[PDB]
Every structure is written in C-alpha cells, then in structure tokens.
Short mmCIF file of C-alpha atoms in Angstrom, two decimals:
data_model
loop_
_atom_site.label_atom_id
_atom_site.label_comp_id
_atom_site.label_asym_id
_atom_site.label_seq_id
_atom_site.Cartn_x
_atom_site.Cartn_y
_atom_site.Cartn_z
CA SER A 1 41.86 10.62 -23.16
CA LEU A 2 39.81 12.29 -20.70
CA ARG A 3 37.93 9.91 -17.91
CA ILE A 4 34.51 11.35 -18.21
CA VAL A 5 31.26 10.89 -16.06
CA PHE A 6 28.54 11.71 -17.64
CA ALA A 7 25.62 12.93 -15.45
CA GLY A 8 22.22 13.69 -17.05
CA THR A 9 18.48 12.04 -17.32
CA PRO A 10 16.45 12.38 -20.56
CA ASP A 11 16.39 12.05 -24.14
CA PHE A 12 18.58 15.59 -24.73
CA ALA A 13 20.93 14.06 -22.26
CA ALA A 14 21.02 10.55 -24.19
CA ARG A 15 22.16 12.75 -27.48
CA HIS A 16 25.17 14.00 -25.74
CA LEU A 17 26.34 10.47 -24.08
CA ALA A 18 25.56 8.78 -27.36
CA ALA A 19 28.06 11.41 -29.03
CA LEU A 20 30.49 10.70 -26.27
CA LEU A 21 30.47 7.11 -26.38
CA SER A 22 31.26 7.11 -30.07
CA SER A 23 34.15 9.58 -29.42
CA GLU A 24 37.97 8.85 -27.74
CA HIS A 25 37.23 9.78 -24.03
CA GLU A 26 36.60 7.23 -21.95
CA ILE A 27 33.11 7.31 -20.31
CA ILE A 28 34.18 5.80 -16.55
CA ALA A 29 30.46 6.20 -15.25
CA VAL A 30 27.00 7.67 -15.82
CA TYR A 31 24.68 9.09 -13.23
CA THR A 32 21.61 9.45 -13.84
CA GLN A 33 17.89 9.83 -12.21
CA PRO A 34 14.65 7.45 -12.57
CA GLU A 35 11.55 8.32 -14.36
CA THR A 36 11.63 3.23 -15.33
CA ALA A 37 15.13 3.17 -16.73
CA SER A 38 16.01 6.79 -17.78
CA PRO A 39 17.11 6.76 -21.90
CA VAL A 40 20.64 7.58 -20.53
CA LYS A 41 21.03 4.62 -18.20
CA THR A 42 19.65 2.07 -21.18
CA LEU A 43 22.71 3.74 -23.33
CA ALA A 44 24.87 2.95 -20.68
CA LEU A 45 23.87 -0.26 -20.18
CA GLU A 46 24.13 -1.34 -23.64
CA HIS A 47 28.04 -0.32 -23.30
CA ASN A 48 28.83 -2.09 -19.67
CA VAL A 49 28.97 1.49 -18.04
CA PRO A 50 28.54 1.89 -14.17
CA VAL A 51 25.09 3.59 -13.55
CA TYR A 52 24.93 5.48 -10.04
CA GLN A 53 21.69 6.92 -8.85
CA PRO A 54 21.93 9.27 -6.49
CA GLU A 55 19.04 11.41 -4.87
CA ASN A 56 21.23 14.00 -4.12
CA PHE A 57 24.68 14.88 -3.24
CA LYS A 58 24.11 15.81 0.82
CA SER A 59 25.29 12.97 1.87
CA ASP A 60 29.60 12.11 2.66
CA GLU A 61 28.48 8.90 1.17
CA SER A 62 27.30 10.42 -2.39
CA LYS A 63 30.55 12.54 -2.55
CA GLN A 64 32.74 9.72 -1.55
CA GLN A 65 31.45 7.50 -4.06
CA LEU A 66 31.99 10.27 -6.86
CA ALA A 67 35.56 10.95 -5.66
CA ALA A 68 36.43 7.00 -5.97
CA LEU A 69 35.76 7.38 -9.17
CA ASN A 70 38.66 9.62 -10.14
CA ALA A 71 37.26 11.39 -12.48
CA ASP A 72 38.83 14.12 -14.95
CA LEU A 73 36.15 15.70 -15.61
CA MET A 74 32.04 15.36 -15.41
CA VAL A 75 30.21 16.74 -18.57
CA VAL A 76 26.36 17.42 -16.94
CA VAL A 77 23.49 17.49 -19.23
CA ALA A 78 19.97 17.60 -18.16
CA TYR A 79 20.71 16.22 -14.61
CA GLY A 80 18.35 17.70 -11.84
CA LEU A 81 20.40 17.47 -8.97
CA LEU A 82 21.99 20.84 -7.59
CA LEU A 83 25.83 20.03 -7.25
CA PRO A 84 27.48 21.33 -4.43
CA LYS A 85 31.07 23.52 -4.74
CA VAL A 86 32.93 20.21 -3.50
CA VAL A 87 31.13 18.23 -6.28
CA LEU A 88 31.86 20.94 -8.87
CA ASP A 89 35.76 20.67 -7.58
CA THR A 90 35.95 16.59 -7.58
CA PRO A 91 36.71 15.89 -10.83
CA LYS A 92 40.47 17.11 -12.16
CA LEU A 93 38.88 19.69 -14.62
CA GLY A 94 35.38 20.46 -12.59
CA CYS A 95 32.09 19.98 -14.40
CA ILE A 96 30.89 21.37 -17.94
CA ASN A 97 27.33 21.36 -18.80
CA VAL A 98 25.59 22.08 -22.06
CA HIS A 99 22.93 24.84 -21.93
CA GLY A 100 20.26 25.25 -24.62
CA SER A 101 20.19 28.63 -24.77
CA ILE A 102 22.98 31.75 -25.83
CA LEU A 103 24.18 32.57 -22.54
CA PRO A 104 23.86 34.90 -20.60
CA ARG A 105 20.21 35.04 -21.94
CA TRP A 106 17.88 32.67 -20.38
CA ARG A 107 19.24 30.89 -17.89
CA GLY A 108 17.30 28.28 -16.21
CA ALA A 109 14.80 25.66 -16.95
CA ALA A 110 13.04 26.65 -20.03
CA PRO A 111 15.60 28.48 -22.66
CA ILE A 112 14.16 26.82 -26.17
CA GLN A 113 10.60 27.94 -25.40
CA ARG A 114 11.12 30.94 -24.40
CA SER A 115 13.75 31.64 -27.22
CA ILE A 116 10.88 31.14 -29.50
CA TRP A 117 7.88 32.74 -27.56
CA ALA A 118 10.10 36.10 -26.97
CA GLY A 119 10.85 36.23 -30.64
CA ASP A 120 14.67 36.15 -30.66
CA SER A 121 16.53 36.17 -33.93
CA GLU A 122 18.55 33.18 -33.10
CA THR A 123 19.45 30.84 -30.11
CA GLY A 124 21.76 28.17 -29.37
CA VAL A 125 23.92 25.74 -27.32
CA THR A 126 26.16 27.06 -24.70
CA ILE A 127 29.26 24.62 -23.20
CA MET A 128 29.46 26.33 -19.72
CA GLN A 129 31.76 25.68 -16.64
CA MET A 130 29.48 24.95 -14.24
CA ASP A 131 30.23 27.04 -11.01
CA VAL A 132 27.87 28.26 -7.87
CA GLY A 133 24.42 29.34 -8.50
CA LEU A 134 22.13 29.17 -11.71
CA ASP A 135 23.87 29.01 -15.01
CA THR A 136 26.35 31.21 -13.57
CA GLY A 137 29.46 29.64 -14.68
CA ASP A 138 32.34 31.17 -17.45
CA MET A 139 31.38 30.19 -21.19
CA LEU A 140 33.69 27.92 -22.98
CA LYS A 141 31.78 27.93 -26.34
CA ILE A 142 28.75 28.92 -28.14
CA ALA A 143 27.42 27.67 -31.19
CA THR A 144 24.09 29.41 -32.40
CA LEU A 145 21.29 28.72 -35.10
CA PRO A 146 18.60 30.87 -36.59
CA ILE A 147 15.35 30.87 -35.10
CA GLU A 148 13.13 30.15 -38.23
CA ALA A 149 9.52 31.60 -38.55
CA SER A 150 8.38 27.98 -38.67
CA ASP A 151 10.04 27.05 -35.62
CA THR A 152 8.52 25.20 -32.33
CA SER A 153 10.02 24.51 -29.45
CA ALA A 154 9.71 20.35 -30.85
CA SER A 155 11.26 21.55 -34.50
CA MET A 156 14.28 23.75 -32.13
CA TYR A 157 14.28 21.11 -29.36
CA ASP A 158 15.38 18.54 -32.23
CA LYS A 159 17.91 20.90 -34.22
CA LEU A 160 19.93 21.68 -30.42
CA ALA A 161 19.72 17.85 -29.54
CA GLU A 162 22.47 17.88 -32.47
CA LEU A 163 23.91 20.88 -32.07
CA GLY A 164 24.66 20.57 -28.55
CA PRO A 165 26.55 17.11 -29.04
CA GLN A 166 28.71 18.59 -31.95
CA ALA A 167 29.71 21.75 -29.83
CA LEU A 168 30.15 19.35 -26.93
CA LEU A 169 32.47 17.29 -28.98
CA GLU A 170 34.85 20.72 -30.21
CA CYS A 171 34.93 21.92 -26.55
CA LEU A 172 35.74 18.68 -25.27
CA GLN A 173 39.00 18.55 -27.63
CA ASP A 174 40.23 22.05 -27.13
CA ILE A 175 40.07 21.31 -23.14
CA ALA A 176 42.04 18.58 -23.72
CA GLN A 177 44.67 19.99 -25.97
CA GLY A 178 44.70 22.90 -23.45
CA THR A 179 43.53 25.52 -25.82
CA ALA A 180 40.03 26.01 -24.23
CA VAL A 181 39.13 30.00 -23.43
CA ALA A 182 36.57 30.78 -20.40
CA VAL A 183 34.65 33.96 -20.48
CA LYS A 184 32.62 35.30 -17.84
CA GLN A 185 29.33 36.18 -18.11
CA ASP A 186 27.79 39.50 -17.99
CA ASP A 187 24.90 39.49 -15.05
CA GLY A 188 23.73 42.59 -16.40
CA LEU A 189 23.10 40.79 -19.59
CA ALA A 190 21.04 37.77 -18.25
CA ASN A 191 17.72 36.69 -17.83
CA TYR A 192 15.75 33.23 -17.10
CA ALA A 193 13.61 31.55 -18.95
CA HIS A 194 10.68 30.72 -16.50
CA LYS A 195 8.80 27.33 -17.18
CA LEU A 196 5.60 27.21 -18.81
CA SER A 197 2.27 26.38 -17.88
CA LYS A 198 -1.27 25.48 -18.88
CA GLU A 199 -2.51 29.27 -17.36
CA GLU A 200 0.05 31.16 -19.57
CA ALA A 201 -1.30 29.03 -22.48
CA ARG A 202 -4.85 30.50 -22.79
CA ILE A 203 -4.95 32.82 -25.43
CA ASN A 204 -5.71 36.33 -24.44
CA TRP A 205 -6.91 37.96 -27.44
CA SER A 206 -6.36 41.45 -26.46
CA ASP A 207 -2.82 40.76 -26.99
CA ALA A 208 -0.93 41.39 -30.13
CA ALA A 209 -1.63 38.75 -32.76
CA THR A 210 2.41 38.45 -33.27
CA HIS A 211 2.66 37.49 -29.81
CA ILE A 212 -0.02 34.95 -30.10
CA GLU A 213 1.53 33.29 -32.62
CA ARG A 214 4.91 32.74 -31.03
CA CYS A 215 2.92 31.57 -27.97
CA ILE A 216 1.56 29.17 -30.68
CA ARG A 217 5.24 27.98 -31.53
CA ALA A 218 6.33 27.92 -28.40
CA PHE A 219 4.22 26.03 -26.78
CA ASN A 220 4.27 23.07 -29.00
CA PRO A 221 4.49 20.83 -27.86
CA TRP A 222 3.29 21.55 -24.40
CA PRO A 223 0.89 23.29 -23.15
CA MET A 224 -0.31 23.81 -26.43
CA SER A 225 -1.57 27.50 -27.23
CA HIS A 226 -5.79 27.50 -26.41
CA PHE A 227 -8.87 28.92 -26.51
CA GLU A 228 -12.55 28.66 -25.65
CA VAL A 229 -15.30 28.65 -27.59
CA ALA A 230 -19.29 26.85 -27.02
CA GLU A 231 -17.88 25.18 -23.62
CA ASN A 232 -14.72 23.55 -25.09
CA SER A 233 -11.41 24.23 -25.24
CA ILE A 234 -9.27 23.78 -28.80
CA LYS A 235 -5.82 23.92 -29.25
CA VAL A 236 -4.08 26.03 -31.76
CA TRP A 237 -1.40 23.81 -33.78
CA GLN A 238 -1.05 26.27 -36.40
CA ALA A 239 -1.19 29.80 -37.24
CA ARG A 240 -0.11 33.09 -39.33
CA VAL A 241 -0.49 36.79 -38.42
CA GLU A 242 -2.36 38.96 -41.06
CA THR A 243 -1.33 42.85 -41.05
CA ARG A 244 -4.20 44.12 -40.96
CA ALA A 245 -5.99 47.51 -39.02
CA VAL A 246 -8.52 45.90 -36.68
CA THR A 247 -11.99 48.02 -35.92
CA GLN A 248 -13.56 44.83 -34.62
CA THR A 249 -13.39 43.71 -30.73
CA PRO A 250 -10.33 41.38 -29.85
CA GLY A 251 -11.60 37.77 -30.64
CA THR A 252 -14.48 38.74 -33.11
CA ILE A 253 -14.51 36.62 -35.94
CA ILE A 254 -13.61 38.47 -39.29
CA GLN A 255 -13.50 35.86 -41.84
CA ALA A 256 -14.43 32.28 -41.83
CA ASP A 257 -12.96 29.55 -44.77
CA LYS A 258 -10.28 27.21 -45.93
CA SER A 259 -7.85 30.09 -46.09
CA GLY A 260 -8.19 30.65 -42.26
CA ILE A 261 -10.50 31.57 -39.66
CA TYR A 262 -9.37 35.04 -39.08
CA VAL A 263 -9.49 36.06 -35.57
CA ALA A 264 -9.47 40.54 -34.42
CA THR A 265 -6.94 40.88 -31.45
CA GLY A 266 -5.09 43.76 -30.20
CA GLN A 267 -2.90 44.35 -33.01
CA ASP A 268 -3.19 42.94 -36.34
CA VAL A 269 -5.46 39.39 -37.39
CA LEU A 270 -4.43 35.92 -36.23
CA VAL A 271 -5.33 33.57 -38.76
CA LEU A 272 -6.12 30.31 -37.15
CA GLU A 273 -4.92 27.55 -39.42
CA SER A 274 -4.85 24.16 -37.79
CA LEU A 275 -7.23 23.45 -34.84
CA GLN A 276 -7.20 20.55 -32.13
CA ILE A 277 -10.91 19.70 -31.29
CA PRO A 278 -11.01 17.94 -27.71
CA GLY A 279 -10.60 13.85 -28.74
CA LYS A 280 -9.44 14.66 -32.41
CA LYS A 281 -6.38 14.66 -33.97
CA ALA A 282 -5.53 18.37 -35.11
CA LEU A 283 -7.37 19.35 -38.37
CA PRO A 284 -7.29 21.58 -41.22
CA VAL A 285 -9.66 24.65 -40.04
CA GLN A 286 -11.55 23.61 -43.52
CA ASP A 287 -12.39 20.22 -41.88
CA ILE A 288 -13.12 22.19 -38.39
CA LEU A 289 -15.63 24.79 -40.26
CA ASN A 290 -17.30 21.44 -41.92
CA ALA A 291 -17.82 19.92 -38.65
CA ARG A 292 -18.49 23.09 -36.30
CA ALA A 293 -19.44 26.14 -38.69
CA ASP A 294 -21.55 26.71 -35.77
CA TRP A 295 -18.71 27.50 -33.09
CA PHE A 296 -16.77 30.15 -35.89
CA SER A 297 -19.19 31.99 -37.48
CA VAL A 298 -18.50 35.53 -38.94
CA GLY A 299 -18.95 38.60 -36.39
CA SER A 300 -19.20 36.01 -33.48
CA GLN A 301 -16.31 36.71 -30.82
CA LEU A 302 -14.33 33.96 -29.19
CA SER A 303 -13.16 33.77 -25.08
#
C-alpha cells in the first residue's frame, strides 16, 4: 500500500480521488485550490484526509511541508500549480499525472476539445511520469476510446472521467508490483492543445461544413459555436453535414424547414438542427422557424 498524496481541484480530479479512496492505497493528504471548497476538498473532508492549499511551491515552507508527509507517490490530476524538479522528486516514486489525451498529441490545456475539433478518430488518457516541462514526461499507460460522430467535449469528458480513474488504478498496481514500463515521448509527434475562445467559436461560413460541424461539437459546452443574424448571436447546439456541391455564397440559406436550416459553406452544406436564441433554451429548428421565420428566409445570407 503506497502512501499517496493526491493533488487536484475540479470534478475531473475528484473522480480520481474517489477511485483512490475506494482502493488499497493510503491517501495521506490532499492538495487542492479554492474556487468555495473544491469538489476535491469536499471529498477529502468526508474521509478525514488532511487538506493542504498552497498558492505555489516557491516558498521553502511549502516544499518542506510536502517533504514531511513522507509520501511514496504523488498523483496529480487537474492541478494548476507548477511543480518544480525538487517537488517532482519529493515523493519516493515521483509524481504521476492523468492527462486527457493520447500523448504526445495534445499536450497542454484543452486536449479533449482539440481532439474533437481536429477530427481525431480516437483519444484517451495517458498516465504520465511527470518531468520538468509541459506534459513532457514518460508515458506509463495509455487507454484509448473512439471519438464517435455524436461526441461533444461534454460527452467525451464524461467518458474520460471514467476511463482515467480505471487506467490510473491499473497503472498504480503495476507500480506497486514493480512491473510498470516507462516510454519516452517522441517530441517530433507532439503538439499542444490551445485553449478555446469566444472569438474562435464565431462561425466562418467560408470554412468547410465538416470543420464547422466539428467546432459545434468541440465547443460544447463552452463557448458554443455561434453566428449572427438580424442583430443577434445564435448558439448552435446541433448540426449535420450534407455532402452537396455548393453554388451559392457561403452563409446563404438554401432550404429552411423542420428537417433543417441548410446553409451554404466553403465546402458542402451545414444543416443547422438545434439553435439557441438569446434568453431561451435551445430549440429544434422547426420551432425556431415558427417563431422567427424572418431571420432564416431562403436566399438570405447569414453573417
């Protein structure tokens, strides 16, 4: 039974701590950040586990407090602190991370969203031995899943929040037993998952419909893909692509009925299916065309 320190803050971290508390290893302390108590903090308290909340590991006091725990391992999931070398090396077996991609692809902050946005055929979780640098450490275990045509960043997050803990616990048993194997990442295949933004989520109708459709899924739940019509910002919750040679200016409404609002793009047609008018829950387009048939008249051009 490893003496484990768990470090992490939001729900994705809490799922891993929960799995560890129902396991064989001793959780001797939890490190987390405030938001309000984090979900990680609340779980720790329910199990009478000491909670530490440093702002960073710059002070000698912070490094010493960690050292005095005599940890065998620190497991780090969705924890915002930079861990310097000395901290990485404080636990007897170092620090392991659960990262939400198939490393070395999508190092960094937005791996779930970017895997979907780029149209990867699969993604997964990597259990990584943390080293100095952004997500550069050796890979101990990878678990993969297909990205389904219906997957959003929400639905994929939900799957990886289950897969991550399962993979972690399997990897931890390998470590405990002395059977883990580290694989060095190849830098030449690495890239970085840059954060999302409201500005990038504005639809450019000159893009390929396939690309807009991946955005619509990747940018759910945040920021939501959006376009402008009349004087309003409409959020797109669901769409599909229709393979159809385009002969009209991108943004032109080609067809508008219960089956879709069909919009010309730079390649193929984007069929809007569920839209959110400011104020209101997202509606099927059948309902949108009842209310505001005027904004989506055939032959008019969306911006």
